[PDB]
Amino acid sequence: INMMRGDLEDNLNQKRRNWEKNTKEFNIQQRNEKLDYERSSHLDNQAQNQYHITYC
Amino acid sequence: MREIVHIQGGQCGNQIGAKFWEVISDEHGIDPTGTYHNVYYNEATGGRYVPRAILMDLEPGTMDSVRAGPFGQLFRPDNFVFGQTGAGNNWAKGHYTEGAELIDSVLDVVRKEAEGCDCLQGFQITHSLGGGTGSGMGTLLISKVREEYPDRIMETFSVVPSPKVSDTVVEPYNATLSVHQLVENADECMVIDNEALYDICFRTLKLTTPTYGDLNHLVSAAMSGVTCCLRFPGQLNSDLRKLAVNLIPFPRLHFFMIGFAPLTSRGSQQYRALTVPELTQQMFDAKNMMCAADPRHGRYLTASALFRGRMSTKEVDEQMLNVQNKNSSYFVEWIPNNIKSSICDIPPKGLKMAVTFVGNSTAIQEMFKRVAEQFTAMFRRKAFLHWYTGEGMDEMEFTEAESNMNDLVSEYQQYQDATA
Ligand SMILES: Nc1nc2c(ncn2[C@@H]2O[C@H](COP(=O)(O)OP(=O)(O)O)[C@@H](O)[C@H]2O)c(=O)[nH]1
């Protein structure tokens, strides 16, 4: 019974670390999508500025 | 549902109205025939749109004026009322004898036009303060319509006489006689004077030959921006009444100042990336406003700013706070947080950012002071007074008008100098 309890708690801790690494995957994806967002918005800003200034 | 009739008057008022209607047609994507490509326009058979405006004047010249310019076919002949003579730069000839017999008829064309709306947010007038026709008729009409619909507000997009660069010799009499009555039954007297318009069009756009078309177009842009935040959705919406509530502390300190942003020429257009703080630095500059009165020479009782386009509201509010806080002297103390903001969601035609600034400020009593100076100088000698006293006018009304003007300027001074 001691061996079984040890094995079960080991598996539970493994599941914990697995979910933690899942959340870290998600966080890195979030950061990179935010960088995509900001660069695309910068190019859109340059586009609107050209459109407004060349408006003679 | 919050509609606005657009009453005009006089030659200047009529030209400004035509320019404003064509600019609004440009914004709302209409063509000079009235086909798409309820607050201002009205629907009409065959998908056509007709402006909800009336056009009054004693001389039929302005009739051909608003016919000649583009977008002249948007209007309807039922709203072309026109006398024959023309008051010829005489105030009383548009307020007592000759103008009267028109205003009655005009009342009709208003009463079968206002009730056409269902929830009328108020009127708006476009006229001059010196010309006899515009000033006199608009004053009588303001009287009548305030007697009729006291619940609605009546903006008066008025162009005060050019203070120093005078084109006529009878400005002060007309301006004083008209203001004496305008101060009673008006709610938003936004003053404009051609001195400031030439100043802007010279020292901010380096233009070659500024004709009246360009000044009318600029005042048109400001006029549109004043209520475009109502015409469209936004993150923080306003109207014609929120402005009034946030702009006047007492029932007769309601005379405003107007400013537009941004404005540059091609040389400067190449430079100066477009960003909200630059817009603030442009709008809160002295010479960047439609009134020849350096606003530093007075205190801002209160001031609202309507933005158009997409931006970050935090930047707007933080710039407003920074500018009201750093220059605390030019602003007034006994009222706190005296600046106001609003933000629309659709900017003008290809203009990523647009700001319209309206400010009730005691720096405009100087204009009335100098106009009354000219008046009392021309009245001590009874100069050019027979032209008026021959038409039923007496000489007591002039003293009453000047004393009311001085009471107004004394109110400005007194409740500027107050403290807490
Ligand atoms: N921005 C602008 N100002 C004008 C115009 N016409 C006149 N003004 C000025 O307004 C004053 C006289 O107004 P006016 O319209 O001629 O008098 P009215 O004939 O009774 O309507 C004068 O100071 C003119 O210089 C115009 O078309 N546009």
TrEMBL record, chain A:
Compartment annotation: Cytoplasm, Cytoskeleton, Flagellum axoneme
Stretches that traverse the bilayer: none
Record's subunit section: Microtubule inner protein component of sperm flagellar doublet microtubules.
Annotated family: Belongs to the RIB43A family.
Name listed for the protein in its UniProt record: Protofilament ribbon protein
Gene source species: Tetrahymena thermophila (strain SB210)
Taxonomic classification: Eukaryota, Sar, Alveolata, Ciliophora, Intramacronucleata
Section covered of the full-length record: 113 to 168 of 280
